[PDB]
Amino acid sequence: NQLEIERLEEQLSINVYDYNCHVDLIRLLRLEGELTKVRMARQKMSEIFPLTEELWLEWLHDEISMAQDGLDREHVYDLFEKAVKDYICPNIWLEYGQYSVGGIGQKGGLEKVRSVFERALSSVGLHMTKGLALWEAYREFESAIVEAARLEKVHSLFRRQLAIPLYDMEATFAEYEEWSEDPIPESVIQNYNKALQQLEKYKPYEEALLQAEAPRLAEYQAYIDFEMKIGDPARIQLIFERALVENCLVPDLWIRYSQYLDRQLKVKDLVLSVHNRAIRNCPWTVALWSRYLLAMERHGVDHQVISVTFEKALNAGFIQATDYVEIWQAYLDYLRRRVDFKQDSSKELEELRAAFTRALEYLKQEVEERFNESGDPSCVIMQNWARIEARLCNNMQKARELWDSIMTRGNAKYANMWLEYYNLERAHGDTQHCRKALHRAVQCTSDYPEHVCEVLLTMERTEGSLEDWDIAVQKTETRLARVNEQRMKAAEKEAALVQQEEEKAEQRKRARAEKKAL
Amino acid sequence: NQLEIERLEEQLSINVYDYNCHVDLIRLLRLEGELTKVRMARQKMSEIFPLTEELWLEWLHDEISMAQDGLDREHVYDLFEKAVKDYICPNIWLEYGQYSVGGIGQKGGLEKVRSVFERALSSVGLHMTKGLALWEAYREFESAIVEAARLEKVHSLFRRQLAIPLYDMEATFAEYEEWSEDPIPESVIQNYNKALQQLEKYKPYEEALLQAEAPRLAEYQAYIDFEMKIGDPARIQLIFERALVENCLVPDLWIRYSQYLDRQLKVKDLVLSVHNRAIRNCPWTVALWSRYLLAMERHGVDHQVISVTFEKALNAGFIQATDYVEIWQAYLDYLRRRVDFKQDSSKELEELRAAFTRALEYLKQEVEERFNESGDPSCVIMQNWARIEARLCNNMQKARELWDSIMTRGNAKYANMWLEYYNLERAHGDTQHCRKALHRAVQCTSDYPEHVCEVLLTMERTEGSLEDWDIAVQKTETRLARVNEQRMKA
């Protein structure tokens, strides 16, 4: 049996991203009874993958069976704390509540049990199908500690629940009437009726969810669309989380959720936790990383931790080269917003300039090596560096050095490219340099040459000397003449190929053998 | 017969630009013998139109026949002076020389005869077909005056002529050996040989010209192409002038000719005579006026005469609305190059700002009434004014006033209009004004809204705060969502 464990152990050392291998290794260590090794393998899997409810539960059950010390109780609590983070988990919460009851009597045991049930209810108390079990477990505990006056607390739990649309809530209203010696107040009956109307209202979606199987993403989306029209922040979070349990590998769903959080709730601890979980579920999508870095910046996360997050993004592994420029650009935009441009020379500015160099080299080395295509064809990073360096810093010279480099890459043929450079020179350079840029455009542009000529003639018309206008008409006339010659000649060749294909089709008319022997 | 004459005179009182009517009025007046009325009709026509050689000759014969030796010889000369101006005219020149011989007895009569023959030879002495008659008339005059020493003058003319390729040139070489007691020198004979080589070169072209029916425009162009390959300035002008005799109504031919003069020769007096002569033949073409104003500026013609030349163009009459903005464009460019922008007074700059205003109004009133279009749909004059006013003068507020007006006239829906405005603000305004322009652009752009959004987003990403970026995505998302709602609706 140990032979097979060693096989799995080495298979993980070659590739640690084999989820099923981790699962197989743990099941075997657990069988062999290696207790410190199972926990070690479980801590190592959990740091890499978010774990499903069933995997957390077996781990929780195992630590609980062996906890034999008051300290191990504390350790089990720490584990429960880890488990609730990955996805919504009504059974884990229920297990946490029931377990925490065992520490009653100790200094904070009564308060602790109330703390976890209350936390459970905030997370899963509105859950149509699995929320009810939590309310019932909470009430049962409260009634078990008191006989005559804490009764107000048990009342409150009955009243809190009956204002919420849950399944079999009807049996809970009846259970409450019998229990209560005091009459059920009119306000409670009205909150219950409105909760029943909500229950009838959400019933078709819950049923569509039930009849559909499985992950039932389309039915989840319809539900989410519905809850957003209604607009209860608490219900919208719930329905997102419910959907994300079965569809955690659908990045657009994470985007949708995090986007709602980033625009509406705007609660730091919540939005960032959700971004992080998106990252653990779908590391391969760059938008998730760039949106994470955005959220960290909006909420004043320390620069060091934002930076270390970015470094993790570079190591996630993406499928496209374009993906790597996107992550670099998000980080670069972030570094750019940290600089005070009102004053040269900022330490932050040198950090920015250092980052740009690093990005271009990273694009030159790592991405080019793996994909064998540059990840930035139109050199958009260099363009941004150039724009910044010329408009925000008084360093037009660096902008020029950059642009000469952008153009050498066969980018010299694009009208829009020359114009991007021209406009940069028109704003922060001199007229002499616009003219040289424009004279170059005319010489090099291959897609829309008439366009760049018009731009050159317009500049000379408005700002140049008569010699300048005359040189401009000469260069443009000459250039356009050459263009029209090749355009016209190539049309001669296509017309010549059509005539060759007509004389080929000609021989086929005069040679039509209706009978074939071969 | 006089009846048809009264009809033509009133038709001219109605419209003075009827060339054939003028020709007909003159034909009847000449025939009817109204000696005083013909001189008038001829003078009033010649000031408007260039006259063909035959029309100048007939006028000249009448004045010479009415020798009214009061004396009109100086006056007849003045007429010849007018006649040589219009086109190349070997018969008018030949006619001028034979006539000038009659005044040889008078003071400096001799220098005058040599003056016109030399002037004639400079214009048409290289003419393959008609140049020879002038060389022969010059020699004939020269051999006729002295016995022993002007014999040299005649020698120089035989030699001068024999170095130039003419038709029937061989018979003049043979004619020279007999007349000349001394042998024909080796240098003269080799220049003759290369000229015979020149005669062979031009022979297929001279003949191709001969076989086609007049104006033989296609055949003339081939010749011009050929002579330009050779690149001899004297020879190039000739073939142009020759072609222009028959094709004076082909503006494209004048353009190539005047263009050759402006790029290659660059001699003030020569280029300006051909440009002036071009507008008189084809006034309806705006390029001819515009190239003319350029040439006057290149050659430093007085500011006052350029303005009157320009004012003349406005009354010429064009077929397109675009033509009127083009001439207006040309004049505005000219006035701008007269301005020193380092000096803010500025005397020239005030004529310029005044000129723009006058121009925009001409398009609103005169051009709009006739065409019911501005002729400047995208407002490039206002665009140019704004650009000048913002980059060269520190008057950015004026550029904005101009741009507001452009957007007001239905250009707010075009992305390129907003971006051009954005780019001006980006260069000579502040960032807050770029932000406002773009925000306006996103709301209004109707043709390519997705594009202007990309431009706003790029800006915020590169210069804006994180909140600025965030506002931009909302504005763009909302705008694009609504746009997409309409393409499904419609």
- 3-state SS, one letter per residue, for chain B: CHHHHHHHHHHHHHCCCCHHHHHHHHHHHHHHCCHHHHHHHHHHHHCCCCCCHHHHHHHHHHHHHCCCCCCCHHHHHHHHHHHHHHCCCHHHHHHHHHHHHHHCCCCCHHHHHHHHHHHHHHHHCCCCCCCHHHHHHHHHHHHHHCCCCCHHHHHHHHHHHHCCCCCCCHHHHHHHHHHCCCCCCHHHHHHHHHHHHHHHHHHHHHHHHHHCCCCCHHHHHHHHHHHHHHCCHHHHHHHHHHHHHHCCCCHHHHHHHHHHHHHHHCCHHHHHHHHHHHHHHCCCCHHHHHHHHHHHHHCCCCHHHHHHHHHHHHCCCCCCHHHHHHHHHHHHHHHHCCCCCCCCCCHHHHHHHHHHHHHHHHHHHHHHHHHCCCCCCCCHHHHHHHHHHHHCCCCHHHHHHHHHHHHHHHHCCCHHHHHHHHHHHHHHCCHHHHHHHHHHHHHHCCCCHHHHHHHHHHHHHHHCCHHHHHHHHHHHHHHHHHHHHHHHHC
Neighbouring residues of B297: CB distance < 8 A, sequence distance ≥ 6:
A466, B306, B334, B337
The three state secondary structure string of A294-336 is: HHHHHCCCCHHHHHHHHHHHHCCCCCCHHHHHHHHHHHHHHHH
Are A167 and A132 within 8 A, CB to CB?
A: yes
What would you measure as the largest C-alpha separation in chain B, in angstroms?
A: 106
Quote the CA–CA distance of B358 and A286 in Å, as a whole number: 58
Q: What tokens does A220 get?
A: 């989840």
CA atoms B456, B462, B463, B468: torsion sign: positive
Give the tokens for residue A95: 């297990």
Q: Residue B125's CB: how many other CB atoms inside 10 A?
A: 24
Chain A residues touching B356 at Cβ < 8 A: none
Q: Buried (b) or exposed (e) across A191-229, using 16+ Cβ within 10 A?
A: bbeebeebbeebeebeeebeeeeeebeebbbbbbebbbe
User: Residue A297 is nearest to which of B336, B391, B466, comparing CB atoms?
Assistant: B466
Q: Is A106 helix (H, G, I), strand (E, B) or coil?
A: strand
Q: Closest Cα partner for B419 from B432, B401, B438? A: B438
> Which residues of chain B lie closer than 8 angstroms to A300, CB-CB?
none
Q: How many helices (H) and strands (E) does chain A have?
A: 26, 0
Question: Within 13 Å of residue A278, how many CA atoms lie on the same side as its CB?
Answer: 29
Sign of the dihedral defined by the CA atoms of residues B241, B247, B251, B255, in that order: negative
Cα–Cα dist B171/A169, whole Å: 131
DSSP H helical ranges for A180-216: 186-211
Closest in A337, A387, A426 to B466, CB measured: A337
Q: Could you tell me the two tokens for A471?
A: 């040189």
Mutation for testing the A interface, residue in B352, B416, B424, B426 having most A CBs under 10 Å: B426
Of the candidates B292, B302, B294, B295, the residue with the CA atom closest to the CA atom of residue B267: B295
Q: Are B173 and B162 in contact (CB under 8 A)?
A: yes
Residue B18 neighbours by CB under 8 Å, 6+ apart? B11, B12
d(CA B114, CA A464): 48
Whose tokens are 């499904």? That residue is B488
Token pair in block for residue B372: 């019911």
Residue with token string 């430093």: B300
Q: With beta carbons under 8 A apart, name residues in chain B contacting A466.
A: 294, 297-298, 337
Q: How far is CA A274 from the centre of its chain?
A: 10
The number of angstroms, rounded, from the C-alpha of A297 to the middle of its chain's C-alpha atoms is 15
- Of A125, A55, A41, nearest to A83 by C-alpha is A55
Distance from CA of B96 to the nearest CA of A (A): 41
Measured CA distances, A337 to A329, A354, B67 (Å): 12, 15, 96
Q: Measure the CA dihedral B479/B481/B485/B487, to 10°.
A: 80
Resolution of this model in Å is 2.6
CA terminus-to-terminus distance, chain A: 72
Classify residue A335 as exposed, middle or buried by CB count within 10 Å of its CB (0-12, 13-18, 19+).
Answer: buried
**CA–CA dist A318, B333 (Å, integer):** 56
Tokens standing for A513?
A: 């053998």
Q: Looking at beta carbons, which residues of chain B come within 8 Å of A390? A: none
A328 to chain B nearest CA, in Å? Answer: 13
- Those residues with Cβ within 8 angstroms of residue B307's Cβ, 6 or more apart along the chain or in another chain: none
Q: How many CB atoms lie within 10 A of CB A47?
A: 8
CA distances A100 to A78, A104, A154, B394, Å, are 12, 7, 19, 77
Q: How far is A513 from chain B (nearest CA, A)?
A: 50
Give the CA dihedral B62, B65, B68, B71, nearest 10 degrees: 90
Q: Report CA-CA distances (Å) from B167 to B125, B126, B211, B238.
A: 12, 10, 17, 16
The partner residues of A104 in beta bridges, in order of sequence, read A106
User: Can you tell me which residue has the tokens 């934002």?
Assistant: A306
- Give the whole-angstrom CA distance, residue B285 versus residue B76: 35
**Alpha carbon distance, N-terminus to C-terminus of chain B:** 74
Annotate A416-437 with b (16+ C-beta within 10 A) or e (fewer): ebbbbbbbbbbbbbeeebbbeb
Displacement of CA A184 from its chain's centroid (Å): 48
Residue B275 contacts residue B298 (beta carbons within 8 Å): no
Residues B97, B134: contact at Cβ < 8 Å? yes
Pairwise CA distance, residues B326 & B367, whole Å? 12
Question: What are A370's two structure tokens?
Answer: 């793996």
CB contact under 8 A, B337 and A461: no
CA nearest to A479, candidates A439, A516, A514, A511: A439
Interface contact flag, A462 B336, Cβ < 8 Å: yes
What are A's interface residues with B at a Cβ cutoff of 8 A? 294, 297-298, 333, 336-337, 384, 387-388, 391-392, 423, 426-427, 458, 461-463, 465-466, 469-470, 474
Q: Which residue has the tokens 């809190």?
A: A160
Angle B210-B216-B219 from CA coordinates, rounded to 5°? 75
Q: How many CB pairs under 8 A join A and B?
A: 42
Q: Give the separation between CA A131 and CA A121, rounded to whole angstroms.
A: 8
Phi first, then psi: give them for residue A106, nearest 5 degrees: -70, 165
Q: How far is CA A510 from CA A446, A500, B1, B401, B437, in A?
A: 44, 16, 74, 74, 69
Three-class DSSP category at A513: coil
Chain B nearest-CA distance from A270, in A, is 20
- Burial readout B73-90 (b: 16 or more C-beta within 10 A, e: otherwise): beebeebbeebbebbbbb
Tokens at A216, concatenated:
């039932």
The Cα A135–Cα A118 span in angstroms is: 10
Q: In the numeric block, which tokens belong to residue A500?
A: 């060759």
Chain B nearest C-alpha distance from A381 (Å)? 11
**A396-405 own/partner pairs: CB under 8 Å, 24+ apart:** A396/A428, A396/A429, A399/A424, A399/A428, A400/A429, A400/A433, A405/A379
From the centroid of its chain, how far is CA A473?
A: 53
Pick from A240, A314, A260: which is nearest to A283 by CA?
A: A314
- Produce one character per residue of A384-414: b if its CB has 16 or more CB atoms within 10 Å, e if not: bbbbbbbbbbebbeebbebbeebbeeebbeb
